[PDB]
Amino acid sequence: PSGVEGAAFQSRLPHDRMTSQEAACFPDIISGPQQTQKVFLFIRNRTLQLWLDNPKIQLTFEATLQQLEAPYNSDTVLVHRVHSYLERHGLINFGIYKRIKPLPTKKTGKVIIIGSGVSGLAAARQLQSFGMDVTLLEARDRVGGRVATFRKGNYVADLGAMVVTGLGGNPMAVVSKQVNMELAKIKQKCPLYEANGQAVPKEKDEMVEQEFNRLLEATSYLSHQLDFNVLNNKPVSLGQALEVVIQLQEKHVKDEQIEHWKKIVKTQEELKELLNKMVNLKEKIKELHQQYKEASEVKPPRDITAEFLVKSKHRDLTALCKEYDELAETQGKLEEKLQELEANPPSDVYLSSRDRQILDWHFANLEFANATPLSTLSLKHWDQDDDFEFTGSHLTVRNGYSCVPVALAEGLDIKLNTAVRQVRYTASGCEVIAVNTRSTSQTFIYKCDAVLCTLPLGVLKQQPPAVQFVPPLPEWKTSAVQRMGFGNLNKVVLCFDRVFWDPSVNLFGHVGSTTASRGELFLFWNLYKAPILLALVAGEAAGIMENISDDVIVGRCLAILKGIFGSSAVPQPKETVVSRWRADPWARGSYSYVAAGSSGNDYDLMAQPITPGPSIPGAPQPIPRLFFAGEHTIRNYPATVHGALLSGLREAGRIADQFLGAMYTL
Amino acid sequence: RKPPKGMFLSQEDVEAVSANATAATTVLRQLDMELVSVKRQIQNIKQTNSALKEKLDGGIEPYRLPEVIQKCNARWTTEEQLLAVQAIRKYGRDFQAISDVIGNKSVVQVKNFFVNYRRRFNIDEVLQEWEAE
Ligand SMILES: Cc1cc2c(cc1C)N(C[C@H](O)[C@H](O)[C@H](O)COP(=O)(O)OP(=O)(O)OC[C@H]1O[C@@H](n3cnc4c(N)ncnc43)[C@H](O)[C@@H]1O)[C@@H]1NC(=O)NC(=O)[C@@]1([C@@H](CC(=N)Cc1ccccc1)c1ccccc1)N2
Numbered sequence: 001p002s003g004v005e006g007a008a009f010q011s012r013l014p015h016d017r018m019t020s021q022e023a024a025c026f027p028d029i030i031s032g033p034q035q036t037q038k039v040f041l042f043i044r045n046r047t048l049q050l051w052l053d054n055p056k057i058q059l060t061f062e063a064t065l066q067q068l069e070a071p072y073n074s075d076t077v078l079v080h081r082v083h084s085y086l087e088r089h090g091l092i093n094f095g096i097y098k099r100i101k102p103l104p105t106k107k108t109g110k111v112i113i114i115g116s117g118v119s120g121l122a123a124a125r126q127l128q129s130f131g132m133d134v135t136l137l138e139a140r141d142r143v144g145g146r147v148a149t150f151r152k153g154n155y156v157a158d159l160g161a162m163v164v165t166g167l168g169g170n171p172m173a174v175v176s177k178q179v180n181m182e183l184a185k186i187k188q189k190c191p192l193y194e195a196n197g198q199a200v201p202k203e204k205d206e207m208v209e210q211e212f213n214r215l216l217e218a219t220s221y222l223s224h225q226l227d228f229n230v231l232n233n234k235p236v237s238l239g240q241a242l243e244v245v246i247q248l249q250e251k252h253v254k255d256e257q258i259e260h261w262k263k264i265v266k267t268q269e270e271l272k273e274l275l276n277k278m279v280n281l282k283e284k285i286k287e288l289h290q291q292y293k294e295a296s297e298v299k300p301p302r303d304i305t306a307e308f309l310v311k312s313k314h315r316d317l318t319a320l321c322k323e324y325d326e327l328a329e330t331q332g333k334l335e336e337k338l339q340e341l342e343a344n345p346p347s348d349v350y351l352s353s354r355d356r357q358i359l360d361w362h363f364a365n366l367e368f369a370n371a372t373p374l375s376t377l378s379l380k381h382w383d384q385d386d387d388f389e390f391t392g393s394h395l396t397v398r399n400g401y402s403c404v405p406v407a408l409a410e411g412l413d414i415k416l417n418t419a420v421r422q423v424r425y426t427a428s429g430c431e432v433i434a435v436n437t438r439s440t441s442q443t444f445i446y447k448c449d450a451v452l453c454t455l456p457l458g459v460l461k462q463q464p465p466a467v468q469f470v471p472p473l474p475e476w477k478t479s480a481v482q483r484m485g486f487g488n489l490n491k492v493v494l495c496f497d498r499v500f501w502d503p504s505v506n507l508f509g510h511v512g513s514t515t516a517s518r519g520e521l522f523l524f525w526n527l528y529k530a531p532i533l534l535a536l537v538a539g540e541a542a543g544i545m546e547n548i549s550d551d552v553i554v555g556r557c558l559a560i561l562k563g564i565f566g567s568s569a570v571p572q573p574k575e576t577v578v579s580r581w582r583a584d585p586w587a588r589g590s591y592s593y594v595a596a597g598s599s600g601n602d603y604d605l606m607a608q609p610i611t612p613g614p615s616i617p618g619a620p621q622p623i624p625r626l627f628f629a630g631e632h633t634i635r636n637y638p639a640t641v642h643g644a645l646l647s648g649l650r651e652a653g654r655i656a657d658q659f660l661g662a663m664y665t666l
Numbered sequence: 667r668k669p670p671k672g673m674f675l676s677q678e679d680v681e682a683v684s685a686n687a688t689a690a691t692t693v694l695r696q697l698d699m700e701l702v703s704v705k706r707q708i709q710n711i712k713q714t715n716s717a718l719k720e721k722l723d724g725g726i727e728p729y730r731l732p733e734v735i736q737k738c739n740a741r742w743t744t745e746e747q748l749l750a751v752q753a754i755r756k757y758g759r760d761f762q763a764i765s766d767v768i769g770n771k772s773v774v775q776v777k778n779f780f781v782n783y784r785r786r787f788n789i790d791e792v793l794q795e796w797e798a799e
Pocket residue numbers: 114115116117118119120137138139140143144145146147159160161162163164165368369370385418419420421454455456459466467489490491581585586587589590591629630631632638639640641642644
């Protein structure tokens with residue numbers, strides 16, 4: 001899409017329809033005449049286009065109205081309402097841009113943001129743009145959170161997020177124009193290598209993959225068409241379903257064989273009855289020929305009865321010889337029908353041991369994308385965010401993803417090494433109690449109108465809690481926290497002096513020996529300028545490999561690489577790093593997934609702000625005080641950077657609406 | 667609406683393989699045994715038919731009689747009439763058999779014989795004695 005309609009697409013908005021959010025801010029327009037709606041839509045779309053065409057400078061109301069035409073630039077309050085809406089909700093003027101009107105001299109309201117991840121930083125920038133007093137409290141000695149980048153010499157590799165999942169409607173596309181991001185496309189081709197260290201031939205490397213995709217569609221069929229979603233009161237997982245589907249494919253394979261050999265016995269038993277009839281007829285023929293012979297020994301001249309006997313037995317013999325020939329005819333037909341059925345048997349097995357192992361790699365890959373064992377994923381909902389996928393090739397940040405949060409962190413009040421311990425929220429305001437991570441007895445108190453909590457779901461899950469809420473979070477919030485899944489996946493960075501792999505190959509797989517270890521070092525990335533190989537640990541392996549030392553992990557890495565490239569072509573690594581995301585106290589995992597028993601609605605519950613009770617009983621309903629952003633709060637883009645980014649933008653809009661007022665709804 | 671191609675999943679089958687913890691292994695074994703059972707049943711009847719085939723060795727070759735090639739005649743010799751009467755006594759209304767016995771009479775001539783010499787050869791009595799066996 002291109003033009004004004006492309007701008008809507010790039011902003012994840014339908015170009016020819018008003019969104020629910022727009023309906024809320026412009027109820028006059030959406031409920032009104034269709035002609036006004038199209039004027040509204042065009043103004044919105046055109047303003048977006050203007051911002052998108054140049055995202056390095058602030059787009060003001062004046063500049064917007066200037067570039068608008070008649071009859072659209074006639075109603076200036078409509079244009080001002082639209083622009084204000086887009087600015088407030090971070091659709092325009094978000095990220096890093098040059099300001100034309102230098103920031104308001106004095107600030108209004110005070111907000112504490114817990115965590116300087118991308119979601120935290122995105123909100124901070126917005127709120128400051130709206131003229132609020134913003135302070136971020138980061139536990140780490142760095143910004144970025146789950147955007148971590150290893151840096152040493154010329155070696156640069158991401159231990160956190162790494163991939164921009166397509167620029168088509170991605171807010172990171174806008175960011176990438178604002179920040180020096182060296183974006184490089186990922187070549188899709190991924191050659192697999194079995195345990196032995198030798199490639200899977202294109203023959204099998206397609207039987208299995210195609211079967212994998214077929215098995216997925218099959219689970220989808222089990223869910224939506226057969227309503228197979230609850231089993232023994234427990235919700236059915238994707239793993240459970242895949243197992244059931246496989247078993248039924250093994251069942252059918254046997255069902256086929258049984259009815260094929262059953263076809264053989266029926267035909268073989270037809271032959272048995274025919275051969276019996278033939279033996280009994282050859283018996284009567286034998287005797288009848290003897291009788292004719294004896295009647296022929298009676299030399300002429302003979303009376304008519306003796307003559308009849310010869311003729312009679314002659315007739316009777318050729319008649320029985322007629323039958324036997326017609327029975328030998330049938331025998332030939334049945335005898336070849338048996339060589340027919342024995343020539344083409346049905347499938348011997350559904351999948352061999354070699355096949356099942358290559359399939360396990362595909363499962364590991366799926367376990368990697370969702371950062372969790374397939375037995376944890378919800379069958380019904382695991383892929384609920386499929387419709388909102390961006391268009392275009394996936395890309396890698398070649399200069400390290402940290403360049404983004406660092407760039408966002410510029411000009412912001414960030415307290416590093418500050419671990420929030422307690423969040424207190426009341427009708428009159430909030431206090432956040434944090435400590436210094438270096439000397440934990442040194443205590444800080446922060447007083448604010450509002451708190452934006454961007455703590456990871458893993459952190460929010462901790463038992464006993466790492467952060468206490470006073471008063472405690474409501475049952476509806478905590479239940480969502482428990483229900484939601486928080487997965488895990490790890491990375492191994494291998495730095496060498498020389499390239500020994502195929503330089504035109506971005507990723508290559510290693511097939512495990514067992515199901516149990518399918519996630520273990522199953523994939524390798526070649527993405528960076530420097531000679532760096534990146535090894536993935538997924539599924540059940542991820543959690544276990546964290547208890548193993550780096551040397552043992554790098555050992556297994558080199559072992560695998562030797563098998564594939566030659567035992568002398570693989571040198572000792574100069575620098576190595578291993579991630580442990582589940583162990584990390586400021587993460588407690590990698591990113592969220594839709595657990596069995598959860599749904600996309602839980603993401604909405606996560607995003608819902610908290611409103612304290614009144615101080616004095618009988619006092620009016622208080623303002624909402626505690627707000628939530630972060631990867632685990634955005635239903636349509638969870639477990640991503642753009643999702644985090646967008647959730648920040650969302651809350652900053654909601655908070656500013658609450659504490660600065662929405663002047664654009666009139 | 668329908669499962670993927672080459673994939674098999676019926677409501678009936680799903681319920682059976684998920685009825686308990688090892689209902690999967692149970693069903694797959696009952697068919698594993700059913701296969702072995704049918705497989706040895708095959709070799710059994712293969713062995714049975716192999717022996718029956720050997721008892722038919724040589725076929726019926728030393729029991730075939732050379733072809734009698736004789737042209738169809740219209741006139742009845744006394745010999746032929748007497749053959750006919752006996753053939754009726756042994757075959758009844760099988761006009762094909764009777765024709766083959768006599769040798770040189772067409773199936774229709776045989777049927778004609780039945781009406782022509784009906785009273786003179788008491789064919790009513792001859793036919794009623796054929797039915798008496
Ligand atoms: C290894 C790994 C790999 C990838 C990602 C994550 C990990 C780990 N993701 C997710 C992505 O990285 C994450 O979602 C976002 O970065 C999260 O941003 P936040 O919401 O802001 O959360 P923070 O924790 O950053 O900030 C919180 C801060 O609070 C502090 N703090 C803590 N405690 C305290 C305290 N007491 N007091 C005070 N402070 C405290 C903490 O120190 C911290 O600083 C990727 N996201 C992505 O866009 N691209 C990627 O390639 C993907 C990634 C995206 C993906 N999975 C897509 C997907 C799609 C459909 C279904 C599922 C998943 C991917 C791409 C391609 C192929 C595979 C993976 N890879």
